[PDB]
């Protein structure tokens, strides 16, 4: 999370690529880490989808087994409207 100073939200325009979650993170919200009920499918930007992290867990980088969602509280607070929710290093 950030917290960290070199870490931040990509927030680039999301495209058609769908964020994933590993077995460990399944059900968890990409933004708040809660298990509030899933509300909207996570999409990531073309750059976050490229490379080593492709198809990997959007939260931890583990092997993706299911699609990531924003929870209902997050969609109410409009956290899905900011763009790509992946944490990046910069
Ligand atoms: Zn949430
Ligand atoms: Zn991104
Ligand atoms: Zn994970």
Numbering used by the authors: 2 to 91
Provide text from the study:
The SF3b core complex contains several spliceosome-associated proteins (SAPs), including SF3B1/SAP155, SF3B2/SAP145, SF3B3/SAP130, SF3B4/SAP49, SF3B5/SAP10, SF3B6/SAP14a and PHF5A/SAP14b. Here, by integrating structural and biochemical approaches with a modified chemogenomic strategy utilizing structurally different splicing modulators at permissive dosage for resistant mutation(s) mapping, we report that PHF5A, a core component of the SF3b complex, is a common cellular target of splicing-modulating chemical probes, including herboxidiene, pladienolide, spliceostatin and sudemycin. The full-length Rds3 protein was recently observed in the cryo-EM structure of the spliceosome Bact complex at a resolution range of 3.0–3.5 Å15. This structure shows that Rds3/PHF5A is a central scaffolding protein, interacting with Hsh155/SF3B1, Rse1/SF3B3, Ysf3/SF3B5, U2 snRNA and the intron RNA. In summary, we identify PHF5A as a key node of interaction for small-molecule splicing modulators.
We purified the WT protein and determined the crystal structure at 1.8 Å resolution. Our final model contains residues 2–93 out of 110 total. The cap is formed by a left-handed, triangular, deep trefoil knot containing three zinc ions and five CXXC motifs, which are permuted between the zinc fingers. PHF5A contains 13 Cys residues and 12 of these coordinate 3 zinc ions in tetrahedral geometry. The remaining cysteine was mutated to serine (C40S) to enhance soluble protein expression. Interestingly, PHF5A incorporates three different types of zinc finger. Zinc-finger 2 (ZnF2) is formed by the second and fifth CXXC motifs. Zinc-finger 3 (ZnF3) is formed by the third CXXC motif from helix-η2 and two individual cysteines from the loops connecting the first and the last beta strands of the mushroom stem.
